[PDB]
């Protein structure tokens, strides 16, 4: 049994530094892969990236590398750091787990495979608005 | 979007986005209105615990054809919004979850 | 003596009126009951290294390749300036080139698109901009489709008043006498397989593997190894690629490659490990008598062109260029080694690569453009000997 | 003179570029075509 608990500021000012923490309840963070998913209203979901056991991360180039995913393994909490936020970053946020998956289609030794990720355990939901008011 | 809300007992079909262009590995999701998005299908057919056998998918003959979720025997707990995460070895990356439905 | 020799090829073929490349319409049908006179106490001496039949066959094979692709398309209007990009894969070996060409009416102009390989291009001098591989030193000629390359056997017959002698000794080197000699008028069923580094659809020896050289102490003499049990190889090319048809001038069409439908894969060959281990182990037991003090190692070849240092052959229409670095590793002292890990996997793989433009027999003014084969390719050859 | 130093545009081995070349050759190999002597 694992539970995810979003906790952020709720409302901030633009062109500043933001931080949202997903408290994890049920397992230590060193066994899972972690991710955040933002949802602009009306449009589809967006995947900002991931973080792994050996600090493996590849952030979204459309996020323009303004994000650094931070972690609190002592309190068992998944945090987030993001600077110079824009009013287009107003989105419903989610924290979620990730699993390993490998697809093979030719001979393996030539490197004809790739990796894909599934998200099974989802958060509960929060809303952070980047607005001048 | 195309609305497909027939009285219960029929078979529904929802198609995904881009033409195929290589071997795929496509996910599916269940975003209930006002709720969190819930994983349904990974690896084009595989089904985790807690989902009935009424859902199926599309194999990897892909090669220019569309991916499709199929819901045979639609019930009352089958009305949500479904997304479509994309992967193929030939067309680059993905950072969005496909066109909404 | 020394004379001319003529072809003989029987009628298991010759039901279709097609012309492949080794004419077979002008080949006389061979005899169903070939007479072999076993001679008496007759001792003739043979010399493998001074034989006129070899130079006759070399001149014949060059002239047969020169008969065809004389009434074929010249690709002189194709040495022009080529743009390029890479193929739209994730984020290469084939290029998507584009070029201006004059049309069939020499008053207008046309823009085209074609995919073909690296190893068939040379860079010209930012936008990358280049030209084709061999269009400043040679006139280049497209081979026709519906013209076959399959190596059907050739018998050599001697005219009346002549005869061919034949060695029947089991273990016979080069350049020695014999004591079991037969006579025929018509040779073995010899197949014109053009290949480097290895001998594919050949003839096997009997009860031993036999090593031949002219002067084995001299290191500038090549060594011919003939096995006694075959070692099967299984090559392929897994790409479902189409073909275009660009028309250049009056009644002359040019056949390029179109798109690729599916994945992008390489062109492996899968030789077996334990079987070839047995073969390479019993070669060196015969090698350790000609040099009976030393360790012997098998090292790979030396740099250079891809069509000299690699195993090159013809696989149903394309020309493969696999390199044999996974084969020739090892080091042997007492007919044992530790260079194969006795575990992990079988099936030693090899990396091929495809090449359209070929100037086999080392020509300096002539080339050839093999048009693409539509579909997928398999060979399953039958390795019988090798050249060290 | 019985020699002539001549220059001419040539279309080279690659059928897009124009080269300019020089050669000496004899009289009795020329015909005058029509000041610059242009034959
Ligand atoms: C020279 O030698 C080399 C090796 O040295 C050979 O290279 C081999 O090439 C083949 C392809 O030609 C490679 O096969 C690929 O392997 C993938 C992984 O195989 C395993 O997958 C899982 C484990 O993760 C197992 O379930 C599988 O076992 C089952 O299937 C096999 C099938 O024969 C049975 O024999 C077994 O008993 C099991 O029943 C394998 O162990 C494999 O996934 C892949 O197949 C998928 O992809 C193709 C692409 O089109 C599909 O056609 C196919 O249907 C598979 O698709 C799966 O997923 C989709 C959706 O996700 C579903 O719709 C499907 O139903 C299916 O579930 C492919 O077969 C092989 O890996 C490779 N060897 C090595 C070591 O890399 C060369 O061929 C050889 N060349 C020559 C000329 O001889
Ligand atoms: C299209 O082509 C692009 C090529 O540009 C390709 O991008 C490549 O994606 C892969 C997949 O993520 C990348 O490979 C991984 O990179 C991570 C992280 O390293 C990068 O990031 C850090 C900063 O975060 C940099 O400092 C670093 O230099 C790299 O840039 C690695 O952690 C990965 O290692 C795992 O995979 C290996 C291969 O199997 C394993 O051997 C290894 O151990 C890791 O696997 C896991 O193993 C165990 C399983 O549980 C576990 O114990 C381990 O801890 C570990 O988690 C891997 O190197 C690659 O860097 C990208 N390419 C480039 C140039 O950056 C796309 O993927 C491709 N897309 C498609 C669809 O084909
Ligand atoms: C095939 O032939 C055509 C003939 O038109 C070539 O087209 C050339 O395209 C370039 C790029 O548009 C043209 O350059 C132009 O230069 C002016 C001057 O600065 C600039 O203002 C324009 O915006 C443009 O850049 C060029 O005029 C045009 N024609 C020629 C004769 O060069 C084409 O490049 C050829 N393709 C190949 C692969 O050879
Ligand atoms: C000689 O040729 C052979 C190929 O037949 C080469 O052997 C290959 O060596 C590599 C590295 O030593 C092996 O890769 C590793 O194998 C181990 C064993 O399973 C595995 O645990 C690793 O993950 C990795 O795959 C490779 O398997 C092996 N190939 C075969 C067919 O066994 C060898 O490197 C060449 N050179 C010499 C000097 O021996
Ligand atoms: C070979 O081809 C070149 C191509 O450039 C020819 O060059 C030409 O040279 C003449 C003389 O310099 C150029 O004439 C120009 O005329 C204007 C107007 O009077 C004047 O202001 C300039 O100073 C210059 O004299 C001409 O533009 C130039 N290009 C072309 C296309 O004709 C060269 O003459 C050719 N040689 C032979 C032997 O045909
Ligand atoms: C092939 O084997 C024959 C043996 O029958 C070799 O012939 C003898 O070679 C020795 C050493 O060169 C000479 O002294 C003899 O005079 C040769 N003849 C006979 C009848 O013994 C022959 O040299 C071998 N050839 C090669 C290339 O190894
Ligand atoms: C090679 O490049 C050409 C560039 O023109 C490609 O041709 C165009 O491809 C687009 C993409 O679908 C089509 O919409 C156009 O109709 C094509 N033609 C033209 C004249 O623009 C071609 O597809 C590329 N081939 C490969 C294999 O990448
Ligand atoms: C196989 O041959 C290559 C060269 O053909 C050898 O490579 C040399 O290795 C030595 C090792 O110290 C280097 O100093 C040289 O620079 C390498 N190149 C050349 C051209 O000599 C290689 O050692 C040989 N392998 C074996 C096992 O003998
Ligand atoms: C022949 O194939 C072999 C495969 O083992 C190639 O050898 C290695 O190729 C990799 C490719 O990047 C190099 O990094 C290594 O340095 C090569 N040598 C070894 C000992 O691993 C070899 O390059 C191929 N030959 C040619 C001409 O491409
Ligand atoms: C013929 O005329 C050409 C004119 O270009 C001469 O070629 C040039 O000669 C000068 C003087 O030696 C050199 O500096 C140049 O490098 C030459 N080439 C060019 C392209 O200008 C040529 O020497 C003349 N020949 C004779 C016999 O008079
Ligand atoms: C060959 O030699 C044997 C033994 O010397 C002799 O008897 C025989 O007649 C010879 N000729 C033939 C044709 O066998
Ligand atoms: C043709 O071009 C290539 C590369 O530019 C060069 O290696 C070759 O020598 C050239 N041939 C001649 C005859 O100039
Ligand atoms: C000579 O070779 C023929 C080939 O069939 C064989 O029948 C014959 O027995 C051989 N003779 C000797 C003496 O070995
Ligand atoms: C063979 O090669 C050696 C080494 O060069 C040489 O001394 C000898 O004369 C050659 N010929 C013969 C018949 O041994
Ligand atoms: C190759 O592509 C053609 C294109 O239509 C198709 O008809 C054929 O079935 C394909 N072959 C394979 C083995 O996929
Ligand atoms: C090789 O020569 C040495 C002397 O240098 C000798 O003792 C040895 O027996 C020779 N090798 C073999 C296999 O006889
Ligand atoms: C020769 O063989 C011995 C034992 O057979 C082995 O220990 C040694 O490594 C081999 N090589 C050399 C150079 O002695
Ligand atoms: C190759 O053959 C030798 C000698 O029989 C043996 O020691 C070695 O284990 C063999 N290797 C493999 C991979 O079978
Ligand atoms: C690959 O290895 C297997 C043994 O595992 C063998 O039976 C098979 O013939 C090999 N494939 C070839 C030689 O193509």
């Amino acid at each position: 049994q694992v539970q995810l608990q979003e906790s952020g500021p709720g409302l901030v000012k633009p062109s500043e530094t933001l931080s949202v923490t997903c408290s994890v309840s049920g397992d230590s963070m060193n066994n899972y892969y972690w991710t955040w998913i933002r949802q602009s209203p009306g449009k589809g979901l967006e995947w900002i990236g991931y973080i792994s056991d050996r600090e493996s991360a590849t952030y979204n180039p459309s996020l323009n590398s303004r994000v650094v995913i931070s972690r609190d393994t002592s309190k068992n909490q998944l945090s987030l750091k993001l600077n110079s936020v824009t009013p287009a970053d107003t989105a419903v946020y989610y924290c979620a787990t990730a699993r390993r998956g490998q697809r093979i289609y030719g001979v393996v030794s030539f490197g004809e495979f790739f990796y894909y990720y599934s998200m099974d355990v989802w958060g509960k939901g929060t809303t952070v608005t980047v607005s001048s008011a | 979007v195309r609305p497909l809300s027939v009285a219960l007992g029929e078979t529904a079909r929802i198609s995904c986005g881009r033409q195929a262009l290589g071997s795929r590995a496509v996910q599916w999701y269940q975003h209930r209105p006002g709720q969190a998005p819930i994983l349904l299908i990974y690896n084009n057919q595989d089904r985790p615990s807690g989902i009935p056998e009424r859902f199926s998918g599309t194999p990897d003959i892909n090669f220019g054809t569309r991916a499709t979720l199929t819901i045979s025997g639609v019930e009352a707990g089958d009305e949500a919004d479904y997304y479509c995460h994309m992967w193929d070895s030939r067309s680059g990356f993905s950072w969005s979850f496909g066109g909404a439905t | 003596a020394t004379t001319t020799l003529f072809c003989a090829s029987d009628a298991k073929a010759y039901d279709t009126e097609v012309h492949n490349v080794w004419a077979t319409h002008a080949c006389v049908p061979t005899d169903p009951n070939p007479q072999e006179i076993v001679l008496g106490n007759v001792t003739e001496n043979f010399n493998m290294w001074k034989n006129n039949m070899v130079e006759q066959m070399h001149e014949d094979i060059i002239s047969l390749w020169d008969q065809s692709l004389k009434p074929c398309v010249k690709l002189t209007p194709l040495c022009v300036t080529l743009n390029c990009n890479n193929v739209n894969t994730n984020n290469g070996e084939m290029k998507n080139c584009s070029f201006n060409v004059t049309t069939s009416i020499r008053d207008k102009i046309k823009k085209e698109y074609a995919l073909f390989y690296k190893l068939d291009v040379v860079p010209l001098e930012n936008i990358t901009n280049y030209r084709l591989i061999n269009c400043n030193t040679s006139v280049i000629t497209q081979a026709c489709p519906k013209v076959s390359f399959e190596p059907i056997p050739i018998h050599y017959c001697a005219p009346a008043g002549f005869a061919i002698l034949k060695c029947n000794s089991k273990t016979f080197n080069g350049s020695g006498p014999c004591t079991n000699v037969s006579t025929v008028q018509c040779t073995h069923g010899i197949r014109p397989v053009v290949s480097t580094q290895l001998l594919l659809n050949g003839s096997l020896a009997e009860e031993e593997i036999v090593i031949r050289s002219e002067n084995i102490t001299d290191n500038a003499k090549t060594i011919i190894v003939q096995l006694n049990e075959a070692v099967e190889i299984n090559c392929t090319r897994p790409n479902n690629n189409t073909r275009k048809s660009i028309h250049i001038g009056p009644g002359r069409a040019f056949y390029a490659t179109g798109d690729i439908i599916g994945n992008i894969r390489q062109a492996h060959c899968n030789i077996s490990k334990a079987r070839w281990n047995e073969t390479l182990g019993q070669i060196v037991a015969k090698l350790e008598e000609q040099f009976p003090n030393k360790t012997i190692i098998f090292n790979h070849s030396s740099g250079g062109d891809p069509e000299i240092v690699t195993h090159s052959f013809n696989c149903g229409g394309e020309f493969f260029y696999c390199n044999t670095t996974p084969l020739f590793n090892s080091t042997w002292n007492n007919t044992r080694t530790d260079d194969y890990p006795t575990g992990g996997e079988q099936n030693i793989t090899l990396q091929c690569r495809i090449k359209q433009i070929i100037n086999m027999w080392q020509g300096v003014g002539k080339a050839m453009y093999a048009p693409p084969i539509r579909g997928q390719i398999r060979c399953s050859s039958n390795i019988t000997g090798l050249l060290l």
Side-chain angles (χ1 to χ4, degrees), chain A residues 15-35:
Chain A
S15 69
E16 291 177 354
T17 305
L18 189 147
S19 179
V20 174
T21 302
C22 178
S23 297
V24 181
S25 299
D27 193 3
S28 180
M29 293 174 71
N30 290 319
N31 289 317
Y32 289 161
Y33 294 171
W34 293 102
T35 184

Side-chain angles (χ1 to χ4, degrees), chain B residues 24-45:
Chain B
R24 290 179 182 273
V26 178
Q27 285 75 239
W28 293 97
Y29 292 97
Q30 180 182 3
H31 186 191
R32 294 177 65 88
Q35 281 70 240
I38 298 169
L39 178 64
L40 293 177
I41 299 297
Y42 64 98
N43 201 3
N44 293 315
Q45 289 175 358

Side-chain angles (χ1 to χ4, degrees), chain C residues 10 17 36 41 48 103 147 153 164 186 230 264 288 302 323 327 341-342 374:
Chain C
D10 55 351
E17 183 63 29
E36 293 183 356
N41 325 128
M48 185 177 74
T103 184
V147 162
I164 295 171
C186 180
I264 296 170
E288 281 180 351
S302 176
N323 76 340
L327 296 177
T342 176
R374 185 179 180 272

